[PDB]
């Protein structure tokens, strides 16, 4: 788990707009992993923007983790 | 096992100057990963910068696939 986690962090963290991962809580459903995450992006960005760093972000996840099923992703505001 | 070589190839074939993934073997040393590797490179590199291209995909393959603990890389040109 920790090395699946630890890739989660660098692929979201390598997207467009991330600043941050904020949380992760991911587990797993026999062999596949589950997983709600809540990234920090620029307060100033639009909630539209947000939205589409938070599906960029579960697109690249999920195409470097192949084990992953379900990704949920959010976004907060970060300094 | 799949999963990890797939890795393997897709970190390797993002490096500068591949020309593919020729040969890949490798084996679980208990949870650990050995491998040998074959690239392709350009016929008109210099040895010494197929060198270079192969010292630079150990380092990406590495960096990316942290159960790696050998990985020996090699260089023949392909068209
Ligand atoms: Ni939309
Ligand atoms: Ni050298």
Redesign the interface.
């Known amino acids: 788990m920790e ?1 699946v986690q ?1 890739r989660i962090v660098e692929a979201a963290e390598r997207v467009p707009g991330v600043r941050g991962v904020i949380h992760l809580r991911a587990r797993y459903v026999g062999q596949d992993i589950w997983a709600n995450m809540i990234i920090g992006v620029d307060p100033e960005n639009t909630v539209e923007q947000a939205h589409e760093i938070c599906e960029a972000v579960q697109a690249a996840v999920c195409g470097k983790i ?2 992953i099923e379900s990704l949920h992703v959010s976004a907060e505001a970060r300094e």
Do not use: E, G
């Open positions: 090395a630890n192949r084990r």
